[PDB]
Amino acid sequence: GAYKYINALNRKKQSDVLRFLRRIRCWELRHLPRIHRVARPTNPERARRLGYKPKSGFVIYSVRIHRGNRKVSARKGIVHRKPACQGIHKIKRVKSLQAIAEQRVGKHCGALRVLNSYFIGQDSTYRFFEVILVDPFNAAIRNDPKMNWICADKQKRREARGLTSAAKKSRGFTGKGRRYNKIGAGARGNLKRRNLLQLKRYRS
Amino acid sequence: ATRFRQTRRRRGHVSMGYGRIGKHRKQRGGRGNAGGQHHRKTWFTTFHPDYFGKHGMRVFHLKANKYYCPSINVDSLWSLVGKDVQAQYKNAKVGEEVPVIDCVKHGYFKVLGKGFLPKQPVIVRARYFSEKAQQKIKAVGGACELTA
Amino acid sequence: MAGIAVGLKRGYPVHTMTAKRHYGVTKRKHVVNDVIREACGFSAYERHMMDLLRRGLDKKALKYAKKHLGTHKRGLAKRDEIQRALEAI
Amino acid sequence: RKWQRKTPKQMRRFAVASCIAASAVPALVSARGHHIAGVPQIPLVVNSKSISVI
Amino acid sequence: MKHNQAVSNIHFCKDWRSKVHTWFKQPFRKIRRHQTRVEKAKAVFPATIKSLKPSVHCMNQRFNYKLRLGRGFTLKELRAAKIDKNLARTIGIAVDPRRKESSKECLNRNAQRLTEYMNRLVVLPKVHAATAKRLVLNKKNAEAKTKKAAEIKKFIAEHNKKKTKQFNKLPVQQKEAKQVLDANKVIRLTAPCTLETKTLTKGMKAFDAVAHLRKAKNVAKAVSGIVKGQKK
RNA sequence: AAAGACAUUUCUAGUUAAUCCUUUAAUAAUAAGGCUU
RNA sequence: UGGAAGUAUAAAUCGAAAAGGUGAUAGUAUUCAUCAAAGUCUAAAUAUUACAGGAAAACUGAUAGCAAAGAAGUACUGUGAA
RNA sequence: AGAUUUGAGUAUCGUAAGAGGACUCCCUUAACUUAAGCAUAUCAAUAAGGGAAGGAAGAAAAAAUAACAAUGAUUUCUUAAGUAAUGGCGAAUGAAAAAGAAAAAGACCAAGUUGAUA
Numbered sequence: 030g031a032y033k034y035i036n037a038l039n040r041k042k043q044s045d046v047l048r049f050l051r052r053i054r055c056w057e058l059r060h061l062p063r064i065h066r067v068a069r070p071t072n073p074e075r076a077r078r079l080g081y082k083p084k085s086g087f088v089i090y091s092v093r094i095h096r097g098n099r100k101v102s103a104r105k106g107i108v109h110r111k112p113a114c115q116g117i118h119k120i121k122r123v124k125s126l127q128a129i130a131e132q133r134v135g136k137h138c139g140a141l142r143v144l145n146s147y148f149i150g151q152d153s154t155y156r157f158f159e160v161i162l163v164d165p166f167n168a169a170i171r172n173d174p175k176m177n178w179i180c181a182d183k184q185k186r187r188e189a190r191g192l193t194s195a196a197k198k199s200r201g202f203t204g205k206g207r208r209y210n211k212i213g214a215g216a217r218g219n220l221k222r223r224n225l226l227q228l229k230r231y232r233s
Numbered sequence: 234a235t236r237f238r239q240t241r242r243r244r245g246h247v248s249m250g251y252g253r254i255g256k257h258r259k260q261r262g263g264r265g266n267a268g269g270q271h272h273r274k275t276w277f278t279t280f281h282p283d284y285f286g287k288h289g290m291r292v293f294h295l296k297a298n299k300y301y302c303p304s305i306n307v308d309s310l311w312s313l314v315g316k317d318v319q320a321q322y323k324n325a326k327v328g329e330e331v332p333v334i335d336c337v338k339h340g341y342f343k344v345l346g347k348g349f350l351p352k353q354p355v356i357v358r359a360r361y362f363s364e365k366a367q368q369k370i371k372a373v374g375g376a377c378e379l380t381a
Numbered sequence: 382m383a384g385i386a387v388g389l390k391r392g393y394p395v396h397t398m399t400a401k402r403h404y405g406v407t408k409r410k411h412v413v414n415d416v417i418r419e420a421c422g423f424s425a426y427e428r429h430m431m432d433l434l435r436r437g438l439d440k441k442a443l444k445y446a447k448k449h450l451g452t453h454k455r456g457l458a459k460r461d462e463i464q465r466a467l468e469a470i
Numbered sequence: 471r472k473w474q475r476k477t478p479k480q481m482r483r484f485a486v487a488s489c490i491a492a493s494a495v496p497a498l499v500s501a502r503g504h505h506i507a508g509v510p511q512i513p514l515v516v517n518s519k520s521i522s523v524i
Numbered sequence: 525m526k527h528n529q530a531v532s533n534i535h536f537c538k539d540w541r542s543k544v545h546t547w548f549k550q551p552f553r554k555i556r557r558h559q560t561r562v563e564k565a566k567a568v569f570p571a572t573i574k575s576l577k578p579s580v581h582c583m584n585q586r587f588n589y590k591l592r593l594g595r596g597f598t599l600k601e602l603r604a605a606k607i608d609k610n611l612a613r614t615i616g617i618a619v620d621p622r623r624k625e626s627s628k629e630c631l632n633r634n635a636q637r638l639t640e641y642m643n644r645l646v647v648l649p650k651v652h653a654a655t656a657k658r659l660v661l662n663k664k665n666a667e668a669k670t671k672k673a674a675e676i677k678k679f680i681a682e683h684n685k686k687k688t689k690q691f692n693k694l695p696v697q698q699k700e701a702k703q704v705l706d707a708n709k710v711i712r713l714t715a716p717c718t719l720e721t722k723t724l725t726k727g728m729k730a731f732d733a734v735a736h737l738r739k740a741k742n743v744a745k746a747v748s749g750i751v752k753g754q755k756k
Numbered sequence: 757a758a759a760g761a762c763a764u765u766u767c768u769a770g771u772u773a774a775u776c777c778u779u780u781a782a783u784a785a786u787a788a789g790g791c792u793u
Numbered sequence: 794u795g796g797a798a799g800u801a802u803a804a805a806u807c808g809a810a811a812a813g814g815u816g817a818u819a820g821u822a823u824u825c826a827u828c829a830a831a832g833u834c835u836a837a838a839u840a841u842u843a844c845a846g847g848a849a850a851a852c853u854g855a856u857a858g859c860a861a862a863g864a865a866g867u868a869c870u871g872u873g874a875a
Numbered sequence: 876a877g878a879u880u881u882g883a884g885u886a887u888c889g890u891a892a893g894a895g896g897a898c899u900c901c902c903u904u905a906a907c908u909u910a911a912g913c914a915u916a917u918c919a920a921u922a923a924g925g926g927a928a929g930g931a932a933g934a935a936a937a938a939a940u941a942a943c944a945a946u947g948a949u950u951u952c953u954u955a956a957g958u959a960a961u962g963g964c965g966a967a968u969g970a971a972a973a974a975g976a977a978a979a980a981g982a983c984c985a986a987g988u989u990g991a992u993a
Contacts, residue, residue: 033986037417040809044421068881078985079832098804101904112914114904121803124902132926140891145832166890175983178834182929185891189927190900194832200901201801204830206939207817208800210971214934214950215900216801217920223970224538225545227952231476263911265966266531272911273525280528287964290778290790293797294817295959296941298973299780301586314719331724337589338717354724360386367734376724377733380383381393381585381944383944386585388740389747389782393588393944396628404829406811414811426808450809453821458810533957537909537918537967545840557838557977575979581944583973588943592974595947613980622937622947624827629944727761735765749774751783756773 035074051150058093058149058157064137067091070159071149079145079161079194082176086167089159090138091149092130096156098122126156127195131188134160141165142179143188146195302361305341307369308348310357313339323353326374331356337380346370423466430463570703575618576641578634579713591713596620597634604631605638606692615647615694616707640711647696658696 041047054071067089070076081087098121100106106117122129127146135143141162149157163170165180178184187193191200201212213219235241243249251257262268269277270285277284311319313334325331336344336359344359346366354374360381367377384394423431426449433442439460446456492498496512506512525532565572578601580594581587596618602609612619617638625631649656704710 030987034413034417036986037413038421041417041421041424043424043808046421074985080984082984096804108905110905113916114906116904119804120904122902123802125803136926138891140889164890175834183932184928186927190933191927192900192933196901198831199802202934203801204814204939205937206815207796207971208815210796210800211794212801215932217901218899218933220920221543222951224543226540226543227545228547230474230547230550232472233476260911263966264909266525267909267911267966269965276525281531284531285965288790291797292778292780292959294780294971296780296972297955297959298584298586299942318719325724327724327726327729329723330721333720333722335720356722356724356728358383361737362733364734367732371729374729376728376731378382378728378731379385379733379736381386381588385736385740387737388744390740395944397945398627398631399624399827402829404812408811410811424808449807451807452809455809462810533967535957535968539918539921542921553977560838580946583941583946584943585945586943587974588945590974591944595979618979620947624947626943626945725761726759730759730765732760732765739765746774748783752775752785753773755784 032074032077036078039072039074055150055152055155055157058091059152059155061091064090064092064134067159070161072147072159075147076159076161079147081144081161084169086164086170087144088141088162088164090134090162092134092146092158092160093155094126094130094133094158095154096126096151124199125195127158128188128191128193128199130156130158131160131193131195134162135186135188138162139186142184143186143193144179145193302343303341304343304345305336306345306347307350307366310334310336310344310355311351313341319351319353323351325354327354331375333358333378335380336360344370350375427459427463430460431467434460434464434467565703565705570701571616571707572703572705573616573707574705575616576637576707576711577618578620578623579637580630580634593708593713594620594623596623597638598623598625600625601631601634601638604635605642606689607638607642608691611694615645617641637711641707642692642695644707644710645695646699647694648701649696649698654698659698662696 039047042051069083070081070089073081076089081089098119101108101117101120103117108115108117127148131143131146134146135141142165144161144163146158146160149159151157163176163179165171165184171177171180184192188196191197201209201216203209211219239250247253248257262273267273305313311334313336314332318332322330322332331354333356336342336357342359343361343363344357344366345363346369350369350373352373354376355370356376356378357370358378358380360379362377370377384390384392426445430442430445433439433445442463443456443460446459447453450456450459494513496506499506499512576597577593577595578597579591582590582592597612597620599609599619599621602612602617602619607617609619649658
């Protein structure tokens, strides 16, 4: 087909062509509102891989986020803490910017379901993502068997609970095995199970 | 049974058996194993002299299943099959059937040689054998078989 | 009677049986690679690596490649790929 | 709190055996507060055919 | 601490009171699970079978002399037993394509398990009515199968004195149904073990078990010296 | 040279190689870790 | 993080593939073993001191048991949170 | 003039919001306290703050363990085990495979192919 070339072409991000196109898009997104809807994905191959389908109920929203790191929110950089917790700079967020961007779009469009998101470009200030959203109350979405899982009640505000791919990676779900001994089925749920002091009915 | 505690025999005694000069205060030298090198050093020297320090090399991830090797002495081999079977083949020798004592089937891997063997030929099958274990088995007229 | 639990020839005597399937590409994947390479060109570090290789500094080219790709094996393959591009011209 | 208690099985079976044995001693049964002065045998057994019709 | 005692290591410095789990629901889990088991026994009636499981060896040398129930038969064990992998899941057989064939002994041991199960298995017709095709076709080939079974009986009469079917027929017949809860309890993992007796010969008498253990150990530790000497 | 079921260990002399232990699939040269002082 | 020459996450820079990841002592080499990441869904076994409806109890019995056995979060206090 | 692309206003049919949050999935760099002082550590995924859910949720179908006579998605329980390891190697913190059970179930997108193409 044709999308095997677009996937191969999209891996040359340092190429002159892709650098030029990303330069024009990043300039445009700097003047448009922070969260706004785009007619069609600007990386259609990457959107298709993540679950986007050119069907009614699938929409694309562009989100611009301020990349980098921000200080710990302490007035005048003053904290009444021991020297171990006295740092202000160099403290990084646990959640990635992609997970944070998805949650800003999801709060903006609370009636839609966040499917997935990908990377569009960046400059010295901003990073640009595009988020796939699905309308759970569309007739097309509800009447197919391969996508109506998104119509479940538990899928409301998916990215806020940590169910999207970007939000799940920040939860530690990037692999299996002894490297992920503390992220078995949820880092916080796993920690509670290991701390339980099981007092049987008949104990010695 | 709280009626057999000492608290029921010290009702009326003011300090409940804790003294008037040195009261029953909150702490008696720290919490937990505090002061192990300063003021409880005489306790750690007296009763656990090798508590502080390091000795040996770290094993970053120990496979404790590799060191699993239950052992049985030669004196305890015949008890795996019982005294009834032992007396049945008491007069066996080379040529006719001799009972086989499969140690692995019973959960023993290595056969060590300690104590004495009854003077009957026996076929001992195991994974590892001690040096004296094989000598004692052979001297009695038996054979040593390897497994796994 | 059973083998031996020690040594290289270790284990119970059985007839142990799996194939080593190779995850590779097809012949057409070379066409896609050349079409995309033609349209896109070479990255900034690939062009710098090419300059060293045409000057005979093949060790410095590897050290440059290892610095950007982070693996000795990855840098070696990239050094081979850039060299094959040079001899094409 | 610890509500239920443990007891080795062979100690429970030891105790049950010593309780069945003591029930065949009329001196011990009467001393427990039972009226057994009229029974034929203190190990009282009734026919299984009579129980089948009850 | 005073007098002679062990050094105490108790991890109660955290809030254990919110980490306390009590088992007051243990007597009622038994009732809940048993009742669910009985309703499971119906609905899928007969044969609430927990699926036939393979016979596999426990991992590591600490356990490898013991057999235990695995999860699912491999595709080769089904092919050896002449069972279609698509039908296998519908007649209470567990299937596991993730498992690779480990040894010939495993392949033969678990192919015999499927063969025994397929003989003990009675499959009811998909349609209860007596005019179903399988019941109709059973009568249709009953005449032909009699001659087909004639040579097979004498096939196993003279020799015992590749043409092998790709798939065996499903045993399908009408019968009075008797429910067994689990088929793994009918087909044993291994036979009961009795005392083993062997003939004592001079060949086994002279065997030096310790020397073979040391030679195997010494040869393993001698491969380091060979490589160093070769590079010299 | 002597015992060994239809292979393989032992003793003897000559040789060549490796040699305090570990880095847990096997080795190698660096590196690191153990033991005694 | 128990993960120790880096177990996981994130950020700045950099950035792959005629595939490759792992075998927890860093490094390179050759074998061996086992998997094939960077999209998604999925019943059952599991938790529950909200709240609602029930049943029990070697629990308390009006200074006890919930703060509250009566029009109890009521009377009363405070600008307010309480 | 006509054919598209992108962006708007209006109408119609719908959707989100708030309550509750015991249990569930997360974000955020508390301190009291312990170390008989204290600064790393501990308290501690703890308190408070913030977001999102259901009758359960989370997880779930190997770029997984292992080095075996080999296993085989996820979850939960027993054991491993106060063990390996971490730690002013101090106070303290601290898993997982194997093994035994409850329950079991595997399915799709993308890419590839078919194009009087739907």
